[PDB]
Amino acid sequence: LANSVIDLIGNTPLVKINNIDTFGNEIYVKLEGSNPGRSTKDRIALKMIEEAEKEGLIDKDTVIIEATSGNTGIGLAMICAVKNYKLKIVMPDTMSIERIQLMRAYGTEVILTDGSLGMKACLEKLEELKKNEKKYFVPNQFTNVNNPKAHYETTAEEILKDLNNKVDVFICGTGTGGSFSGTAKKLKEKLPNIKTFPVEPASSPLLSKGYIGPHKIQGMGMSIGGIPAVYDGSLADDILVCEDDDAFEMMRELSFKEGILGGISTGATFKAALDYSKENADKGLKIVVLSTDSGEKYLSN
Amino acid sequence: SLANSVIDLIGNTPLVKINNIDTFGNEIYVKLEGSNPGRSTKDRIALKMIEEAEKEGLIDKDTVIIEATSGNTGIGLAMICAVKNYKLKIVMPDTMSIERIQLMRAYGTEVILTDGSLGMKACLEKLEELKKNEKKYFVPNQFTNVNNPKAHYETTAEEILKDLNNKVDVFICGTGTGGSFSGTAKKLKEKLPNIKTFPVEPASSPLLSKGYIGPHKIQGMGMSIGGIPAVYDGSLADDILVCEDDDAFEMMRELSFKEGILGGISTGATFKAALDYSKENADKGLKIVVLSTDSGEKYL
Ligand SMILES: *Cc1c(COP(=O)(O)O)cnc(C)c1O
Ligand SMILES: [Ca+2]
Ligand SMILES: [Ca+2]
Ligand SMILES: [Ca+2]
Ligand SMILES: [Ca+2]
Ligand SMILES: [Ca+2]
Ligand SMILES: [Ca+2]
Ligand SMILES: [Ca+2]
Ligand SMILES: [Ca+2]
Structure with missing residues (x-):
C-alpha cells in the first residue's frame, strides 16, 4: 500500500x-x-516542498509560485494536489500544450510568457506575480x-x-x-x-x-x-x-x-x-x- | 529495479x-x-496472449499480429511487439482518443481505422480482410x-x-x-x-x-x-x-x-x-x- x-x-x-x-x-x-x-x-518538487515545510516557509494558504519549462510545474502540481496547496506556474508559450493540460488537470493555474524570450522572461513575470500574492513560496529550482x-x-x-x-x-x-x-x-x-x-x-x-x-x-x-x-x-x-x-x-x-x-x-x-x-x-x-x-x-x- | x-x-x-x-x-x-x-x-493481457501463443508455436518471427482494440490492448501489444520485433496491425474505431493512434504508431504499429458509429463489431469485420492479405498471422482476440x-x-x-x-x-x-x-x-x-x-x-x-x-x-x-x-x-x-x-x-x-x-x-x-x-x-x-x-x- x-x-x-x-x-x-x-x-x-x-x-x-x-x-x-x-x-x-x-x-x-x-x-x-x-x-x-x-x-x-517529481523528486525535486517533493524535496523542495518538504524541506520548505520543515523550515516553516509554507502554510496551508501559502501560494506556491514557480517558473518552469513544464515538468517541474507538473511535479509540483501533483504534489500540491495531494497536499491541498495552491500552485501558480509561469511557463513559456513554446512548450508542449500537453504540459499545460497536465498541470491544469491537477488544479494548477498557468501564466504564459513569450517563449522567444526564454526562461528569463518567466522569471521576470514571476516577480510581477509576487506583487499580488500576500503569502507565497518560490521553490526556485535554478538556485x-x-x-x-x-x-x-x-x-x-x-x-x-x-x-x-x-x-x-x-x-x-x-x-x-x-x-x-x-x-x-x-x-x-x-x-x-x-x-x-x-x-x-x-x-x-x-x-x-x-x-x-x-x-x-x-x-x-x-x-x-x-x-x-x-x-x-x-x-x-x-x-x-x-x-x-x-x-x-x-x-x-x-x-x-x-x-x-x-x-x-x-x-x-x-x-x-x-x-x-x-x-x-x-x-x-x-x-x-x-x-x-x-x-x-x-x-x- | 534493474x-x-x-x-x-x-x-x-x-x-x-x-x-x-x-x-x-x-x-x-x-x-x-x-x-x-x-x-x-x-499490458498484462498483451503479454500473456503473446507469450502463450509463442509457446503454442502460433507466432513465428514473420507472423503478423492482428487485433481489434479500443486502444489500450493495441498499445500494450505494440510495446511488446516493438521489444520482440513482431509486425503488428491494429484496427480501432475512429471515435477513440487520437493519442491512442499516435502512441501505437510511435511503437511501429500499423493502425487502421473504422467508423466508430459502428462499434467494435466493425473492427472485427475489418480483421477478416486483413487476414486474407497475410501468409502468417495470429489474432489474439481479447474478446474470446x-x-x-x-x-x-x-x-x-x-x-x-x-x-x-x-x-x-x-x-x-x-x-x-x-x-x-x-x-x-x-x-x-x-x-x-x-x-x-x-x-x-x-x-x-x-x-x-x-x-x-x-x-x-x-x-x-x-x-x-x-x-x-x-x-x-x-x-x-x-x-x-x-x-x-x-x-x-x-x-x-x-x-x-x-x-x-x-x-x-x-x-x-x-x-x-x-x-x-x-x-x-x-x-x-x-x-x-x-x-x-x-x-x-x-x-x-
Ligand atoms: C480495455 C479497457 C477497459 C475494459 O477492460 P476489460 O478488462 O477489457 O473489460 C476499461 N478501461 C480502459 C481504459 C480499457 O482500455
Ligand atoms: Ca462520514
Ligand atoms: Ca448525469
Ligand atoms: Ca574527471
Ligand atoms: Ca569516495
Ligand atoms: Ca502447448
Ligand atoms: Ca517493429
Ligand atoms: Ca540535423
Ligand atoms: Ca510496424
Missing part, C-alpha cells in the same frame, strides 16, 4: 538496451517517466540546493543499488543542471573512476561554445541569462551535444526498437550516449542514461 | 489509499494500472481469449490479496471485454468466499443491466461487438453497477484535483460507481478495491 501518490515517487526502473546495437558496451536507461508525474522532477540534493539522495543511490555499484559512465541532459549535478556528485563520491557527462542542445551550446540559440529539445538548454547555480560544471568530464532532429529521430528509434517511450530530451541524451559508446566501442562499459520524462506529452510535436 | 526490457515492468502495480475524497467510512484503495509501462492494465482473464486471475488478483494481506471486502472494475473484472473476481472469490465483486458498465450503454446499447463517452468500457464477450463471466457479478458520462468526467477531475491521481475516463466511471456503492454501504469499514485501468494522459 501507498498512502498517496507521493509514496510512488522514485524507485524507478533501469532498463537494458537489447535491440539497438550499443557497440560492445551495455547501456541502461533510468526511466524517470515512471514517476507518478511522469518525470524526474535551490534541494533540486540537486534530491538526486544525490535518491536517483544516484538507486543507480548504485540496481547495478550493484558497477557503473562506468553516467550521461544526463541538462536544463537547470540539477539532475546531472546531484546524481553525478553522489556517483563520483562512491565510484571515484566513473565518468559523468552532461548533454546540451547543439543549437544552444552554452557550456561547449558559450552562446545560446533557439532549439526544440524541450526541457534542455539554459535560457535564464547565465549558467544556473545548481549546475556543477566541475563534474562534467566533457560536454556532449545533440541536434534537434537527431533527438527526435532517436526518440522514435527508442520506441520502435526498445518499446521505450521517452521525451525529446531522452532522445537527445540517448543519442549522445550511443555516440559516446561508439567512440568507446568494445570496452565492456556499463553506461547509464537518465531518461527525464516519458514521451506521451510530445505527441502534439 | 529490468532486461520494459516487458519486465508489466504488473506489480501500486494500490493507493484514497485520503482526501470523502469515502463514507469505508476504505477505498485504487489499483493504479496506469503505472504499467504501456500505461494500462492491458482466455489468456485475457487468466492474466488477471494469475497476477492482478494475487497482487491485491498480497498488498491488503487477504483483507478485501469489495472489488469494483469497469468492463469492456469483461476480462479484468472476470479474471480478477474469479481468483478473489476462490480465496475470499465472502468478497463481493461488481462490474461497471456505461449507464448510457447498459447492455448487461438493461439489454440495450447506446452511445457513451467512457472510452474502453461498453460492449459493442454484437453481444456479450465470451471472456465476461456474469456469474461472478454480485450486481451490475453503472456510471453516466458526466459523472465519470467529474470524478476523473475530482481524482486528479484532490488525490493527485490522473486516471482515464473509465477510472472516473469505476471510481464513481465505487463511491456510490460505498455511500449506500456507509460506515461499515469495508475495504473496497477499485481497478484504475489506465492513466489519464491520453485523454488530454
Whole structure:
C-alpha cells in the first residue's frame, strides 16, 4: 500500500538496451517517466516542498509560485494536489500544450510568457506575480540546493543499488543542471573512476561554445541569462551535444526498437550516449542514461 | 529495479489509499494500472496472449499480429511487439482518443481505422480482410481469449490479496471485454468466499443491466461487438453497477484535483460507481478495491 501518490515517487526502473546495437558496451536507461508525474522532477518538487515545510516557509494558504519549462510545474502540481496547496506556474508559450493540460488537470493555474524570450522572461513575470500574492513560496529550482540534493539522495543511490555499484559512465541532459549535478556528485563520491557527462542542445551550446540559440529539445538548454547555480560544471568530464532532429529521430528509434517511450530530451541524451559508446566501442562499459520524462506529452510535436 | 526490457515492468502495480475524497467510512484503495509501462492494465493481457501463443508455436518471427482494440490492448501489444520485433496491425474505431493512434504508431504499429458509429463489431469485420492479405498471422482476440482473464486471475488478483494481506471486502472494475473484472473476481472469490465483486458498465450503454446499447463517452468500457464477450463471466457479478458520462468526467477531475491521481475516463466511471456503492454501504469499514485501468494522459 501507498498512502498517496507521493509514496510512488522514485524507485524507478533501469532498463537494458537489447535491440539497438550499443557497440560492445551495455547501456541502461533510468526511466524517470515512471514517476507518478511522469518525470524526474517529481523528486525535486517533493524535496523542495518538504524541506520548505520543515523550515516553516509554507502554510496551508501559502501560494506556491514557480517558473518552469513544464515538468517541474507538473511535479509540483501533483504534489500540491495531494497536499491541498495552491500552485501558480509561469511557463513559456513554446512548450508542449500537453504540459499545460497536465498541470491544469491537477488544479494548477498557468501564466504564459513569450517563449522567444526564454526562461528569463518567466522569471521576470514571476516577480510581477509576487506583487499580488500576500503569502507565497518560490521553490526556485535554478538556485535551490534541494533540486540537486534530491538526486544525490535518491536517483544516484538507486543507480548504485540496481547495478550493484558497477557503473562506468553516467550521461544526463541538462536544463537547470540539477539532475546531472546531484546524481553525478553522489556517483563520483562512491565510484571515484566513473565518468559523468552532461548533454546540451547543439543549437544552444552554452557550456561547449558559450552562446545560446533557439532549439526544440524541450526541457534542455539554459535560457535564464547565465549558467544556473545548481549546475556543477566541475563534474562534467566533457560536454556532449545533440541536434534537434537527431533527438527526435532517436526518440522514435527508442520506441520502435526498445518499446521505450521517452521525451525529446531522452532522445537527445540517448543519442549522445550511443555516440559516446561508439567512440568507446568494445570496452565492456556499463553506461547509464537518465531518461527525464516519458514521451506521451510530445505527441502534439 | 534493474529490468532486461520494459516487458519486465508489466504488473506489480501500486494500490493507493484514497485520503482526501470523502469515502463514507469505508476504505477505498485504487489499483493504479496506469503505472504499467504501456500505461494500462492491458499490458498484462498483451503479454500473456503473446507469450502463450509463442509457446503454442502460433507466432513465428514473420507472423503478423492482428487485433481489434479500443486502444489500450493495441498499445500494450505494440510495446511488446516493438521489444520482440513482431509486425503488428491494429484496427480501432475512429471515435477513440487520437493519442491512442499516435502512441501505437510511435511503437511501429500499423493502425487502421473504422467508423466508430459502428462499434467494435466493425473492427472485427475489418480483421477478416486483413487476414486474407497475410501468409502468417495470429489474432489474439481479447474478446474470446482466455489468456485475457487468466492474466488477471494469475497476477492482478494475487497482487491485491498480497498488498491488503487477504483483507478485501469489495472489488469494483469497469468492463469492456469483461476480462479484468472476470479474471480478477474469479481468483478473489476462490480465496475470499465472502468478497463481493461488481462490474461497471456505461449507464448510457447498459447492455448487461438493461439489454440495450447506446452511445457513451467512457472510452474502453461498453460492449459493442454484437453481444456479450465470451471472456465476461456474469456469474461472478454480485450486481451490475453503472456510471453516466458526466459523472465519470467529474470524478476523473475530482481524482486528479484532490488525490493527485490522473486516471482515464473509465477510472472516473469505476471510481464513481465505487463511491456510490460505498455511500449506500456507509460506515461499515469495508475495504473496497477499485481497478484504475489506465492513466489519464491520453485523454488530454
Ligand atoms: C480495455 C479497457 C477497459 C475494459 O477492460 P476489460 O478488462 O477489457 O473489460 C476499461 N478501461 C480502459 C481504459 C480499457 O482500455
Ligand atoms: Ca569516495
Ligand atoms: Ca574527471
Ligand atoms: Ca540535423
Ligand atoms: Ca462520514
Ligand atoms: Ca502447448
Ligand atoms: Ca517493429
Ligand atoms: Ca510496424
Ligand atoms: Ca448525469
